[PDB]
Design a protein around this nucleic acid. Structure first.
Ligand SMILES: [K+]
Ligand SMILES: [K+]
Ligand SMILES: [K+]
Ligand SMILES: [K+]
Ligand SMILES: [K+]
Ligand SMILES: [Mg+2]
Ligand SMILES: [Mg+2]
Ligand SMILES: [Mg+2]
Ligand SMILES: [Mg+2]
Ligand SMILES: [Mg+2]
Ligand SMILES: [Mg+2]
Ligand SMILES: [Mg+2]
Ligand SMILES: [Mg+2]
Ligand SMILES: [Mg+2]
Ligand SMILES: [Mg+2]
Ligand SMILES: [Mg+2]
Ligand SMILES: [Mg+2]
Ligand SMILES: [Mg+2]
Ligand SMILES: [Mg+2]
Ligand SMILES: [Mg+2]
Ligand SMILES: [Mg+2]
Ligand SMILES: [Zn+2]
Lengths: 155, 110, 102, 52, 49, 144, 118
RNA sequence: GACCGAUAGUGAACCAGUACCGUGAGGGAAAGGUGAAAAGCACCCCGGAAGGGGAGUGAAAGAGAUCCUGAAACCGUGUGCCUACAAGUAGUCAGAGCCCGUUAACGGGUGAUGGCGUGCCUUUUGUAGAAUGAACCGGCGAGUUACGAUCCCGUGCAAGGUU
RNA sequence: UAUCCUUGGGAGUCAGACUGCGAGUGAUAAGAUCCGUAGUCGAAAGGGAAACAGCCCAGACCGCCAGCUAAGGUCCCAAAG
RNA sequence: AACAGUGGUAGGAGAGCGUUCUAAGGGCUGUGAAGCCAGACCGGAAGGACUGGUGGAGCGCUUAGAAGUGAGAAUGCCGGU
């Protein structure tokens, strides 16, 4: 703003007599180079919904997955070694074409590394599931162990 | 078939150059030269050199006959201005425009 | 032979084969329209309606249902910050006069 | 006094009609064939009244 | 719901009013503050009560 | 749309003679002005000169009622200070009969370009004879 | 995010200048005077679309009167005669007859004349 | 980075706290873009040179050094219509004639002549106003954000609601 | 005939002008000044009063080369005796 | 469908156009993007297309979101003329 712009202290010219418009500073907002009137200032955009609305949101989104037959439940998901080739083969086996969210019960290092590099394939712990992730990814590959952990919290 | 010559950014005000350009526009090239030689204006020699350049281009690059040529187009466009400042009374300064011209001559057979 | 017929809110002098633009009729392109309100018949045998010529009619063919060239209505009031801009395209029915049944 | 209103492009052009040059009063020099100004000695060949 | 087919609940959101953006908006020029006097000035108006 | 408009191609102009003898200045003038403007023609068109040529004879014999002969004053100003000149109706009719008739009619015509053009079709003459034999002018009687 | 002036300003002003084609001097060249004239033309065009309907009626009446007086009737009496005879031909059509088919007009005029002499 | 993109963003994208201004403290700018690659126009012609016209390079020179794009003001050249008896807020409605041929439309350009008609804005009881503001064009230039209060609306739960 | 009242959210307004009528101040002056009362203007374009915010007629959503009227008019300008 | 209504300053209320950025879908583009320049096209308005010329690499569309979001006036600032 006009206070922060370099310079601009003195009055550009005397108030009367010159025939110019009266001015107070060369950094007034109507001057080229001058301060901005209003404009962006650093602020946070975050706000919080009531807990029950949070739970209702995530439940709504999960139940919607079930209505569209985009919920794939696995007996378990265990990779022998971190290998993107292995993970890509698994997804093709399950007919996973577009994006997919993989939800494991606990931190599964082998799965996280195998899926990290594939575009549109996200890996998440049961704790980490969230509305935006589920809505964004078309398919939801959750493990049986992970389903119970999610149910444990929400139910 | 046209032959063109251009003197760009000649230090001569376009208004002044145009006064002379109007004398030769449309004239036969032989007559035009005699009009420039006998018109006592600053632009005359400048425009004459451009006209002679055009004639040379017509003769050399296009094998046209210099005696059959006519000035089919002749105009002066404004070039960039050199801006200068003359000191006046009471500390005031006044602008001076040292104007330039783009002088173009196109000759062709009649 | 020509006739003066009232159609729209207006009167038109018509001859057979003439193409006339009139106010929009409830009629599809190609359909045959009849004008029952004939006020006057000219040419050789001159019928004068009072107000209409009894029994006379003019049949004609709907050529096109269209809208006229657009006019932009713009009105303002000086010094009172009052502007109003409004487009208009008046519907019309293009008709070709087939027969004047006097 | 200062201009009360700017001059239009039309009024400017109408004024400058008479602001014109004339073609010079030329006549061929019968000696050398160059064009000189009538009644002036020929610059090119130096001739006048048929004398150099 | 789809990220490309989001719809807010009807009447849950309204567009802000931007004053001083031309005559046709209805808050052009004086931006709703009438003409002159203390109430029309920037940071104008008297203290509460 | 449809309303036909006269134009220079369509117009045919008659020549009419009007005898001023015994006629009232203003009442003759108003009817002559109608003829000059073409109001008597069903093809009258406002932006074209559709009127006929009028010849006025015996201008010197125009009449005025009341005391207008002595009291009606024709003013003009020369655009010089105190340059207001005047003439009585008597003097005008005696010495400028054509001017008197022309003034009355010119005042009753439109004032702009076409109105001045219409006036060019008027011809006012002092005596009973006019030089326009060749135009074959018809006698025109005033309609009251 | 910052919104630059961009191309919106030039587009809007060009539209107005295009509407000002054929205006004298600056009025077809400079936006402000062009904009004023285009606005002024709007008011004039509205006014004259309503004046058109008076000018043509005025023209028709003048023509009918001329043609009527060729049948020894003033316009006043002719129109009264037609009303008494129940003739609903309007002045646009009467004027058309007067100009294009004078014999037809005389027939209507004679009808009026009959009613007046009654 | 739901920050700026060369009048923006640092005063300073560039030899900027420089140039310039001031005795001094101090104030304080303007100014980015050839091409992928200099392959940066050998040679010829006019010219003292500048600047051109060819020829070559290149995809392009109408990319040739203030070298991407190149708007408006403004300045010109050519001409389809009109213009030297005319009183003009310059247009609008009517309208021949002449000249064109489109996003194909009850088309385009010009406009003899007729009717009507005293700019825009601000401020005023009232302004064409001889009251104020604007030479013109372009860009920039003014109810925003934070935190509280209250009301309407939407949603969740409800004698509970919420961290 | 279709307004009215309560509650709540947001205002702007506190320079008014003239015309008719009833009064004051003035000189039974003022386009003066101050009230009452109605209207128009303000914030109202159109028609008439030559031009003419306030007077007469009358309230513009928009198109029409249709018709009937208001005030005011109908010899010419300029529609209509 | 019927009926009725639709002048407007201060001001209140509603519905929209357009600009920059983000998300998600779906596209366009060296067979030529944005910008610029024309045109006699389209919509009730803000406005939107189509075609051709220039340009030489980025840009729309749909839904939603966020704003340095719209200029003709400030003896406005700067540049050009
Ligand atoms: K006030
Ligand atoms: K730039
Ligand atoms: K400006
Ligand atoms: K007011
Ligand atoms: K192209
Ligand atoms: Mg400071
Ligand atoms: Mg000194
Ligand atoms: Mg308002
Ligand atoms: Mg103010
Ligand atoms: Mg801007
Ligand atoms: Mg900067
Ligand atoms: Mg490039
Ligand atoms: Mg005052
Ligand atoms: Mg003031
Ligand atoms: Mg001034
Ligand atoms: Mg008073
Ligand atoms: Mg007013
Ligand atoms: Mg109304
Ligand atoms: Mg009547
Ligand atoms: Mg009359
Ligand atoms: Mg802004
Ligand atoms: Zn010699």
């Amino acid at each position: 703003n006009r206070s922060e712009v370099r310079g601009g202290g003195r009055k550009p010219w005397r108030q009367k007599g010159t025939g110019r418009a009266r001015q107070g500073s060369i950094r007034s907002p109507q001057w080229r180079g001058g301060g901005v009137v209003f404009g962006p200032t650093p602020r946070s955009y975050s706000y919080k919904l009531p807990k029950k609305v949070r739970r209702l949101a995530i439940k709504s989104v999960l139940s919607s997955k079930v209505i569209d037959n985009n919920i794939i439940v696995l007996e378990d998901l265990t990779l022998d070694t971190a290998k993107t080739k292995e993970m890509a083969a698994i997804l093709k086996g399950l007919s996973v074409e577009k994006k997919a969210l993989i939800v494991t019960a606990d931190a599964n290092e082998a799965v996280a590394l195998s899926a990290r590099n594939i575009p549109g394939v996200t890996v998440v712990e049961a704790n980490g599931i969230n509305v935006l992730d589920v809505v964004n990814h078309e398919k939801l590959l959750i493990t049986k162990a992970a389903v119970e952990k999610v149910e444990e919290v929400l139910a | 078939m046209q032959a063109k010559a251009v003197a760009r950014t000649v230090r001569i005000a376009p208004r002044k150059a145009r006064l002379v350009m109007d004398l030769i526009r449309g004239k036969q090239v032989g007559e035009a030269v005699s009009i420039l030689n006998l018109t006592p204006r600053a632009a005359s020699p400048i425009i004459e050199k451009v006209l002679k350049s055009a004639i040379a281009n017509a003769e050399h690059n296009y094998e046209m006959d210099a005696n059959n040529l006519v000035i089919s187009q002749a105009f002066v466009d404004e070039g960039p201005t050199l801006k200068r400042f003359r000191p006046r009374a009471m500390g005031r300064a006044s602008q001076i425009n040292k104007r330039t011209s783009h002088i173009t001559i196109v000759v062709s057979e009649k | 032979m020509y006739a003066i017929i009232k159609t729209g809110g207006k009167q038109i002098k018509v001859e057979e084969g003439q193409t006339v633009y009139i106010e929009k009729l409830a009629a599809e392109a190609g359909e045959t329209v009849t004008f029952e309100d004939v006020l006057f018949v000219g040419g050789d045998n001159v019928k004068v309606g009072n107000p209409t010529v009894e029994g006379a009619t003019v049949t004609a063919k709907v050529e096109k249902q269209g809208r006229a060239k657009k006019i932009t209505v713009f009105r303002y009031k000086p010094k009172k910050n009052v502007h109003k801009k409004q487009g208009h395209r008046q519907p019309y029915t293009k008709v070709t006069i087939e027969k004047i049944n006097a | 006094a200062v201009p009360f209103r700017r001059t239009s492009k039309m009024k400017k052009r109408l004024r400058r009609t008479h602001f014109k040059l004339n073609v010079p009063g030329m006549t061929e020099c019968p000696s050398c064939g160059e064009m000189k100004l009538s009644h002036r000695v020929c610059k090119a060949c130096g001739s006048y009244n048929g004398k150099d | 719901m789809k990220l490309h087919e989001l719809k807010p609940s009807e009447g849950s959101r309204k567009t802000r009013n931007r004053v001083g953006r031309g005559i046709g908006s209805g808050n052009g020029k004086t931006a709703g503050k009438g003409h002159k006097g203390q109430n029309a000035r920037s940071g104008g108006g008297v203290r509460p009560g | 749309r449809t309303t036909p408009m006269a134009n220079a191609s369509t117009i045919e102009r008659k020549w009419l003679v009007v005898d001023a003898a015994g006629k009232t200045l203003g009442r003759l003038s108003s009817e002559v002005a109608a003829i000059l403007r073409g109001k008597h023609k069903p093809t009258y068109t406002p932006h074209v000169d559709t009127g006929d040529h009028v010849i006025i004879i015996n201008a010197e014999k125009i009449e005025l009622t009341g005391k207008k002969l002595t009291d009606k004053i024709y003013y003009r100003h020369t655009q010089h200070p105190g340059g207001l000149k005047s003439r009585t109706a008597l003097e005008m009719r005696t010495n400028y009969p054509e001017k008197m008739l022309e003034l009355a009619i010119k005042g009753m015509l439109p004032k702009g370009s076409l109105g001045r053009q219409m006036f060019k079709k008027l011809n006012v003459y002092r005596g009973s004879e006019h030089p326009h034999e060749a135009q074959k002018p018809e006698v025109y009687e005033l309609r009251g | 995010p910052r919104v630059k002036g961009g191309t919106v300003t030039r587009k809007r002003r060009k539209k107005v200048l295009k509407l000002a084609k054929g205006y004298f001097g600056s009025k077809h060249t400079l936006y402000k005077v062009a904009n004023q004239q285009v606005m002024k033309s709007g008011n004039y065009a509205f006014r004259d679309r309503r004046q058109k309907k008076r000018d043509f009626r005025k023209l028709w009446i003048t023509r009918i009167n001329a043609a009527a007086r060729m049948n020894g009737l003033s316009y006043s009496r002719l129109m009264h005669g037609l009303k008494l005879s129940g003739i609903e031909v309007n002045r646009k059509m009467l004027a058309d007859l007067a100009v294009n088919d004078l014999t037809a007009f005389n027939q209507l005029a004679d009808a009026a004349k009959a009613q007046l002499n009654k």
